[PDB]
Amino acid sequence: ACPEDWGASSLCFKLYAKGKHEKKTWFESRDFCRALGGDLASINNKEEQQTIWRLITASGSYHKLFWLGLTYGSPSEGFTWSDGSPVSYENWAYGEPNNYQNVEYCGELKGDPTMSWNDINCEHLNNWICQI
Numbered sequence: 487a488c489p490e491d492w493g494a495s496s497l498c499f500k501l502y503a504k505g506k507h508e509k510k511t512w513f514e515s516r517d518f519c520r521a522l523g524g525d526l527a528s529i530n531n532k533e534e535q536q537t538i539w540r541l542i543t544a545s546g547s548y549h550k551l552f553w554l555g556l557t558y559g560s561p562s563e564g565f566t567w568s569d570g571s572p573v574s575y576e577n578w579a580y581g582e583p584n585n586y587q588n589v590e591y592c593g594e595l596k597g598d599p600t601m602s603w604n605d606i607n608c609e610h611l612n613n614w615i616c617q618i
């Protein structure tokens with residue numbers, strides 16, 4: 487059972503699309519989700535991707551960018567999820583991750599129907615999604 491305000495399919499997810507001045511870095515977003523007892527959202531299969539897409543449609547958060555729990559590990563690991571669990575299912579956008587200019591070590595979701603991922607600099611301010 488998920489809490490009533492969390493979207494379910496299982497993992498539970500919640501969108502945080504806040505004011506223009508209330509976005510957070512990847513690390514700030516991770517700390518926020520962990521303070522709730524959860525973490526930044528991981529997308530581990532097509533069912534979880536659909537759960538989050540339907541959360542986006544229900545909110546009207548179209549076109550927005552969201553932090554996911556994607557973080558680059560060691561060179562041999564590549565991207566992992568924020569709790570260290572491995573990236574198995576992937577939905578990177580075309581050409582991604584491209585580590586553009588060698589400074590992109592966190593992952594963001596483009597919240598449109600493609601639900602694609604991009605690596606981006608971790609100090610960008612974005613919306614975020616938590617899991618619990």
Ligand SMILES: C[C@@H]1O[C@@H](O[C@H]2[C@H](O[C@H]3[C@H](O)[C@@H](O)[C@H](O)O[C@@H]3CO)O[C@H](CO)[C@H](O)[C@@H]2O)[C@@H](O)[C@H](O)[C@@H]1O
Pocket residue numbers: 581582584586590604605606
């Ligand atoms: C926005 C960026 O998109 C991918 O990086 C691509 C890169 O983006 C350029 C964009 O074309 C340009 O309008 C903007 O002013 O600067 C961006 C770079 O920060 O463009 C190159 C072509 O030169 C490639 O197509 C890159 O894929 C994405 O990978 C980045 O993380 C970022 O979201």
Ligand SMILES: [Ca+2]
Pocket residue numbers: 582583584585586590604605606
């Ligand atoms: Ca990129």
